[PDB]
Amino acid sequence: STTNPTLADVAARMTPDGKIDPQIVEMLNETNEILDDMTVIEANGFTEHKTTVRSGLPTGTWRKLNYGVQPEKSRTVQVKDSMGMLETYAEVDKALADLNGNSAAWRLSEDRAFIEGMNQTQATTLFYGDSSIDAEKFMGLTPRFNSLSAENGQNIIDAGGTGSDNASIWLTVWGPNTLHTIYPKGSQAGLQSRDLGEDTLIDAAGGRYQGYRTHYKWDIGLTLRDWRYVVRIANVDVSELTKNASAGADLIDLMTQAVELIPNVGMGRPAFYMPRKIRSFLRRQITNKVAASTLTMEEIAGKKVVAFDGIPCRRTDALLLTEARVV
Amino acid sequence: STTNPTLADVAARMTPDGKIDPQIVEMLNETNEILDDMTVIEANGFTEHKTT
Amino acid sequence: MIIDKLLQVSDGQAVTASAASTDVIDFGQANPNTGMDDRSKMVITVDESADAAGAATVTFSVQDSADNATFADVAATGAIGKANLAAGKQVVIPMPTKLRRYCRVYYTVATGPLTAGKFSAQVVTGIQQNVAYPDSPRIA
Amino acid sequence: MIIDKLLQVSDGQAVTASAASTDVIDFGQANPNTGMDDRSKMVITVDESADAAGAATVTFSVQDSADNATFADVAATGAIGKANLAAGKQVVIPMPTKLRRYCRVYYTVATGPLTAGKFSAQVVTGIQQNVAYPDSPRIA
């Protein structure tokens, strides 16, 4: 009936008059950037990264002379967090890649496209990866900060929104002891494009129908050592945002209060992560707040947002714009 | 009824496949600083500090 | 959360009446006793939610058998209520310390019957569980 | 099996009715959550035997509470039969993953009332569990 999916006979769709077309315009790629900014250390447990995290301090006592006071005990619970493997093979019939001499040119353009699809999913799953939903995937930044009731609920700042159409801004601090990704011992991080070599295949019929194959493993999960270093600005109604910091939620304060929420950004490095929609309204609103003060003729449009606190403000496409309200 | 506390067998609670967890994430510590900023001088009376 | 495709049981099963899991894990031995790995553990994850006429509870329970014929509980949870089975809730059962060949998952649904709700049961090593912990809590 | 003087609960309680344990473990936090420890586990030992009018079962089960007052079961075993409770039978409950302050052990006795049988509950790391396994079994 329907017959897929090895890369076949529409290598014709990827050439000019000639060899594989180098200047193919990557339409579908989106350049969200958590992947560059995140730090990675090998997860320590068998398939989790266990973490002992302090639950209680000893309180001490004032003692009157000649009178021994009770000993104290520092209580401390642990929390572990898992991984998920994200991988695909990419087989091509060997004859198809070799012809018109484009074995490596083809292998390459299909490779670039792979790396791109992989960053796309790793990045969307890093924010909305539920392990209780997806079963398979590691759990991301939601819904670790989901309910306002969770004991780290104070770290999510309610934008004051409602309706179904609403974003969130993230602010993290990526570093070995506050928030990082983890890869297993010892499958290494982060995205291994291993080339399997040419190898024989089998026809559905049975003949050798012999060809290539490429692996693209990428297995990461996500340790949030302590939520104190991560803040969520949830329920930010996107329709109600206006450039005049007027209707809806002001970003410049919703963002500064986010900055004040982190206990001393000391290590390693913080970052804001917002949908491009937000980045645009953040920009408009900043030039608008300064407008009531001192903005020049030439800086009317405003310097594009780079470092807010300064903390880098990294654009992330792979970030849902109409997410259901979190209350 | 309820039994405790000097240091119940929850050293288990602080370890990996292995030894005591060094990188423990210090949660309930807060960064208040008078203690750093405060001045300290020996008190002058016997166990009080008189001031005219 | 890593998953062995073979230990996966009840992929996204609509548990409406008090029923058993679809799939049954057959270990290749009379007594795997996989609680002793002190690492394997059952998980029942939730989607989308425990909608029912209510108020109903779902007591998840692991069952062994000598042969794949009659099951018996070797682990249980207690009556987990509806409105604790929102999309996204790992209800963990530590692996019973004494397993037999052929383990399955029973969903003892206290009345009335659930109108909607899928569940994912599988043995993993081990869970993704990162509960939020206190702060001061004096400030703030 | 090494033991914490404090994690000992119900030392040798002559459980005759379906009663709760003598002592209640008080952890010093809202959420000890010692199931995540992947090491703690409750053990209930039996002596001398669950002799009763019969046929009776004792469902051992752990309970949490916010405060030392109202409990709810967080893990259970199932109806372990009489004559599966001779002197020297550990029924191990791996520790529930989501504990609260104040844990205790309940002995849910199905009718009739037990006439003789103590049970000893304590949290250990870890159980002494060594069941014998087959050999060939051809030889011999």
Side-chain angles (χ1 to χ4, degrees):
Chain A
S1 298
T2 57
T3 24
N4 276 324
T6 295
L7 289 55
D9 189 70
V10 293
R13 240 73 93 100
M14 289 193 184
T15 62
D17 187 20
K19 303 173 288 184
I20 277 287
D21 200 329
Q23 192 60 235
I24 141 163
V25 53
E26 288 291 337
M27 187 57 57
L28 264 83
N29 87 295
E30 55 195 19
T31 68
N32 77 84
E33 315 164 3
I34 7 284
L35 300 324
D36 311 331
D37 214 30
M38 75 190 183
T39 61
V40 198
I41 71 170
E42 198 183 26
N44 65 273
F46 185 63
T47 317
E48 350 78 309
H49 173 87
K50 206 97 79 177
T51 301
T52 64
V53 42
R54 182 75 64 182
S55 175
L57 292 186
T59 194
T61 43
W62 316 88
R63 83 165 188 81
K64 28 198 162 184
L65 256 286
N66 306 114
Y67 207 63
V69 332
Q70 304 307 131
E72 274 80 9
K73 177 187 178 183
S74 293
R75 291 164 172 85
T76 287
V77 290
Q78 57 194 315
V79 281
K80 51 181 180 306
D81 49 69
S82 64
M83 297 171 290
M85 294 185 177
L86 178 60
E87 55 194 0
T88 53
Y89 298 80
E91 73 202 14
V92 179
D93 168 16
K94 183 263 185 68
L96 293 196
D98 272 30
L99 55 77
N100 295 316
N102 298 323
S103 185
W106 163 265
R107 203 73 158 279
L108 191 80
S109 85
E110 199 61 6
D111 184 41
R112 292 154 49 84
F114 262 55
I115 263 64
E116 185 53 28
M118 287 277 95
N119 293 326
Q120 220 97 343
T121 3
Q122 211 69 259
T124 192
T125 187
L126 202 63
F127 290 101
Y128 319 112
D130 197 334
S131 61
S132 300
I133 294 297
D134 299 315
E136 292 186 333
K137 313 172 195 172
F138 65 92
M139 203 176 70
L141 295 180
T142 320
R144 289 170 194 250
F145 302 87
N146 195 85
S147 300
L148 274 297
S149 301
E151 207 176 13
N152 65 334
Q154 66 202 58
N155 256 17
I156 154 269
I157 292 167
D158 182 26
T162 181
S164 55
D165 60 308
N166 61 92
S168 55
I169 295 162
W170 292 82
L171 165 51
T172 79
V173 179
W174 294 95
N177 51 8
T178 66
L179 180 86
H180 61 266
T181 67
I182 40 164
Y183 61 100
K185 169 175 181 176
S187 305
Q188 84 190 12
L191 186 72
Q192 298 170 135
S193 178
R194 189 200 311 98
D195 175 32
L196 272 63
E198 172 175 353
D199 55 50
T200 180
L201 267 50
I202 297 286
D203 207 270
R208 87 187 124 225
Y209 188 98
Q210 205 269 8
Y212 291 109
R213 198 136 59 191
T214 304
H215 210 203
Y216 295 81
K217 186 166 185 60
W218 190 354
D219 48 342
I220 57 169
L222 194 81
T223 312
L224 181 257
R225 283 297 190 94
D226 58 334
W227 51 262
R228 261 153 56 265
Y229 283 63
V230 179
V231 348
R232 191 195 201 190
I233 312 181
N235 324 280
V236 199
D237 202 330
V238 285
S239 46
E240 269 57 38
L241 290 181
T242 71
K243 91 273 181 179
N244 298 115
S246 180
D250 159 26
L251 307 195
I252 310 160
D253 77 328
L254 251 49
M255 194 154 296
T256 61
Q257 65 176 114
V259 168
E260 288 300 344
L261 253 53
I262 292 167
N264 53 269
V265 175
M267 60 310 165
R269 54 184 175 282
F272 279 89
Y273 289 109
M274 53 198 199
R276 184 217 80 265
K277 265 288 298 296
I278 296 300
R279 198 147 116 306
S280 184
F281 282 36
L282 177 282
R283 217 268 283 276
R284 283 137 53 91
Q285 272 179 355
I286 283 166
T287 67
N288 263 236
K289 200 158 71 61
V290 139
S293 136
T294 306
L295 84 171
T296 42
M297 269 60 173
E298 65 274 15
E299 202 186 1
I300 165 74
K303 170 178 165 60
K304 71 189 294 180
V305 46
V306 177
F308 173 83
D309 183 45
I311 283 166
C313 180
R314 306 284 187 175
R315 182 163 86 101
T316 281
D317 304 323
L319 204 163
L320 176 57
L321 194 72
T322 55
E323 179 190 2
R325 155 245 190 87
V326 306
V327 59
Chain B
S1 296
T2 59
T3 10
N4 58 297
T6 172
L7 215 316
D9 188 27
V10 287
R13 181 191 39 68
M14 298 185 189
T15 62
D17 194 28
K19 303 177 288 183
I20 269 284
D21 198 329
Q23 192 66 235
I24 137 181
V25 42
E26 290 293 336
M27 186 58 59
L28 264 78
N29 84 294
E30 55 206 20
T31 72
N32 71 80
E33 314 165 4
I34 5 284
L35 302 324
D36 313 330
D37 201 31
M38 78 182 185
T39 48
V40 287
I41 77 172
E42 199 181 24
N44 67 274
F46 185 67
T47 55
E48 27 62 34
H49 182 88
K50 207 96 77 179
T51 297
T52 51
Chain C
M1 181 173 69
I2 197 70
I3 296 171
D4 187 27
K5 172 66 178 180
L6 313 192
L7 299 173
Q8 175 74 45
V9 309
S10 189
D11 181 36
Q13 184 177 358
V15 172
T16 58
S18 191
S21 174
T22 56
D23 285 321
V24 167
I25 295 165
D26 175 33
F27 304 92
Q29 44 200 14
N31 301 98
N33 293 333
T34 61
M36 276 68 167
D37 205 334
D38 286 323
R39 208 181 299 264
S40 305
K41 33 194 50 246
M42 194 60 74
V43 193
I44 325 296
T45 54
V46 189
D47 355 44
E48 294 290 335
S49 190
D51 182 28
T57 76
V58 183
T59 313
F60 308 107
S61 57
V62 159
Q63 303 172 344
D64 281 7
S65 58
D67 65 323
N68 193 17
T70 48
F71 294 80
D73 294 27
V74 288
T77 301
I80 292 298
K82 69 181 290 181
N84 285 268
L85 304 173
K89 209 288 181 182
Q90 292 178 7
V91 181
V92 177
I93 319 176
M95 216 61 195
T97 185
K98 278 179 183 175
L99 243 146
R100 299 143 66 190
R101 215 165 203 276
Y102 312 101
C103 169
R104 79 120 74 96
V105 182
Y106 198 75
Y107 304 87
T108 306
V109 173
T111 53
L114 267 56
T115 66
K118 323 296 180 60
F119 299 100
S120 307
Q122 62 278 35
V123 196
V124 308
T125 69
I127 47 168
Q128 200 286 271
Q129 190 67 14
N130 189 272
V131 183
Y133 267 137
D135 38 325
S136 281
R138 72 169 60 83
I139 184 163
Chain D
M1 179 175 69
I2 202 67
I3 302 167
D4 192 89
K5 178 74 173 183
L6 311 189
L7 296 175
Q8 179 72 43
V9 309
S10 190
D11 183 35
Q13 180 178 355
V15 174
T16 55
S18 189
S21 171
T22 57
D23 286 323
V24 167
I25 294 165
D26 179 32
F27 301 95
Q29 40 202 11
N31 301 95
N33 290 332
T34 65
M36 275 69 167
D37 205 335
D38 284 323
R39 215 189 310 267
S40 306
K41 40 187 50 275
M42 193 59 73
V43 208
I44 324 296
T45 51
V46 191
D47 25 316
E48 292 289 334
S49 190
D51 185 29
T57 69
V58 179
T59 316
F60 309 111
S61 57
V62 163
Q63 303 171 343
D64 276 8
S65 62
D67 64 321
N68 194 20
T70 50
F71 295 76
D73 298 29
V74 296
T77 305
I80 285 297
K82 68 185 291 181
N84 292 269
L85 302 169
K89 217 293 178 184
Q90 297 173 29
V91 179
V92 182
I93 336 175
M95 218 62 188
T97 175
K98 286 172 186 173
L99 264 172
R100 301 145 65 187
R101 216 164 202 277
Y102 312 95
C103 166
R104 76 121 83 96
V105 174
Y106 196 80
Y107 304 115
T108 310
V109 166
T111 54
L114 267 54
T115 52
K118 331 295 171 56
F119 303 120
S120 306
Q122 62 280 87
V123 195
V124 313
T125 59
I127 51 169
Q128 210 292 323
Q129 201 81 293
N130 185 93
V131 190
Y133 281 109
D135 39 21
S136 282
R138 77 158 63 87
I139 180 166

